[PDB]
């Protein structure tokens, strides 16, 4: 049946494809601005980072924190006043911007309009029908290979992108701690100088001064 409430531009024998995605597995013979037909039923695109489940204070190298909700990358600090956590807005925003750039690029479908070339109700001549069937199978074999390759590329690039953003953040906190702190194995920094929650919030942004604590921290390292 036909109703005038909804709007789609892709049609097949059983209804209307209404939503924009790169590919589809409803019908090979579809009319209009349509997603490409692929043989694969499921093709999942990585919209998030690589997930290692959680199993004194941990780090990126060991596991990932399930309690982090303010962002994708966070700063957990153990101090004499207490234990508190936050999130980094710069690295999380950059990761979200690059993933949304990937999504805008892929989600848009074509503007090419395709017609019916085969009558499902009444068969076409058998020679040109076999030519059409062979061409459609070759085209959907090309598009299925392209779909699998594209999904694998963007998943691998998303995982490597998240790892690179973590490496950039870790190098940034290393560049702030010139000779005041040193690297404790699991992705953490062991702070030698006594500095409060104001110090932790100062190392959260890029305002940490190394010269104010350099003498006592260096005396702590040499001893």
């Amino acid at each position, epitope marked *: 049946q036909v109703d005038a409430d909804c709007e789609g531009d892709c049609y097949y024998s059983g209804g209307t494809i209404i939503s924009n995605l790169p590919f589809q597995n409803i019908d090979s013979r579809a009319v209009g601005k349509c997603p490409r037909y692929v043989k694969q039923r499921s093709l999942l695109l990585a919209t*998030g980072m690589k997930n290692v489940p959680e199993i004194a204070i941990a780090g990126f190298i060991e596991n990932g924190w399930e309690g982090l*909700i303010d*962002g994708w990358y966070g700063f957990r600090h153990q101090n004499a006043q207490g234990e508190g956590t936050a999130a980094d*807005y710069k690295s999380t925003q950059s990761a979200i911007d690059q993933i949304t750039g990937k999504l805008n690029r892929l989600i848009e479908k074509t503007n090419q309009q395709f017609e019916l070339i085969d009558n499902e109700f009444t068969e076409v001549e058998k020679q040109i029908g076999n030519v059409i069937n062979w061409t459609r199978d070759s085209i959907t074999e090309v598009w299925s290979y392209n779909a699998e390759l594209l999904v694998a590329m963007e998943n691998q690039h998303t995982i490597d992108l998240a790892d690179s953003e973590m490496d950039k953040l870790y190098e940034r906190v290393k560049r702030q701690l010139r000779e005041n702190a040193e690297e404790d194995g699991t992705g953490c920094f062991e702070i030698f100088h006594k500095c409060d929650d104001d110090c932790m919030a100062s190392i959260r942004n890029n305002t940490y001064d190394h010269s104010k604590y350099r003498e006592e921290a260096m005396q702590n390292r040499i001893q």
Partner: antibody, heavy 128, light 105 residues
Framework: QVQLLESGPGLVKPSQTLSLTCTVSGGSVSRGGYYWTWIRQHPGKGLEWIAYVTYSGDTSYNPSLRGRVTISLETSMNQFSLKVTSVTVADTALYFC???????????????????????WGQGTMAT | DIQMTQSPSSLSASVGDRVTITCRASQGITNDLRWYQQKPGKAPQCLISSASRLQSGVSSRFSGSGSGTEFTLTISSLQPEDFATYYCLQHNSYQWTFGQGTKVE
């Protein structure tokens, strides 16, 4: 379709406490990744930021008057309330509540629903 | 208390004229400015967030730029429904401060 409807008395005795509750009618207030803010404006003046609270517990009240205003997040009745004590004539203004997102997601990669990335403001409740 | 100073306070322009508006911050604020438009007697709504972006649904005629202490918003074409008041918010530090006020007519 999250609506940040506000409730209040509307008539405040001088040198007394005032309770302003902005009820969240939507998915949840415990989602995280949002600044739950109170914004006020006297007519003929500008907007003045009051306080912001998160579900994680971070709370920076306006440097203008930290002692007078207290903001608290209440998950059970899905609302966050602003309490200002010793209310004077200058404290009387039109009040707004807003859900300011942490990040900018047009497609829901962090929030998840593609409508949570928007900035939703309350209708407003004038208090005297 | 980064001082947000806007100038000039009152603007008058005809329909279809470009409105160049300035938001001034004292500190070296980095990439953190939300632009708010309110109609009189009406809840404010954000236009430019991050100083180079547009809430999905906001019309593309609104365009913001600027970095550092200097911040600019440009309007390509004025509308009869654009009679409103434009504000800029800073969110870099733990403190949030508004400007004094800029009105178009």
């Amino acid at each position: 379709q999250v609506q940040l409807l506000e409730s209040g008395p509307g008539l405040v005795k001088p040198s007394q406490t005032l309770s302003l509750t902005c009820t969240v009618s939507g998915g949840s207030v415990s989602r995280g990744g949002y600044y739950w803010t109170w914004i006020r404006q006297h007519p003929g003046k500008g907007l003045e930021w009051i306080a912001y609270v998160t579900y994680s517990g971070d709370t920076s009240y306006n440097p203008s008057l930290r002692g007078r205003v207290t903001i608290s997040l209440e998950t059970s009745m899905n609302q966050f309330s602003l309490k200002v004590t010793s209310v004077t004539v200058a404290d009387t203004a039109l009040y707004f509540c807003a859900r300011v997102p942490f990040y900018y997601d047009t497609r829901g990669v962090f929030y998840g629903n593609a409508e949570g990335g928007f900035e939703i403001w309350g209708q407003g409740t004038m208090a005297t | 208390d980064i001082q947000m100073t806007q100038s000039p306070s009152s603007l008058s322009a005809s329909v279809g004229d470009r409105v160049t508006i300035t938001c001034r911050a004292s500190q070296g604020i980095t990439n953190d400015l939300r632009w708010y438009q309110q109609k009189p007697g009406k809840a404010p709504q954000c236009l430019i967030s991050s100083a180079s972006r547009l809430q999905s649904g906001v019309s593309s005629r609104f365009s913001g730029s600027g970095s550092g202490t200097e911040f600019t918003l440009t309007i390509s074409s004025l509308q009869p429904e654009d009679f409103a008041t434009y504000y800029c918010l800073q969110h870099n530090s733990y403190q949030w401060t508004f400007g004094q006020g800029t009105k178009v007519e």
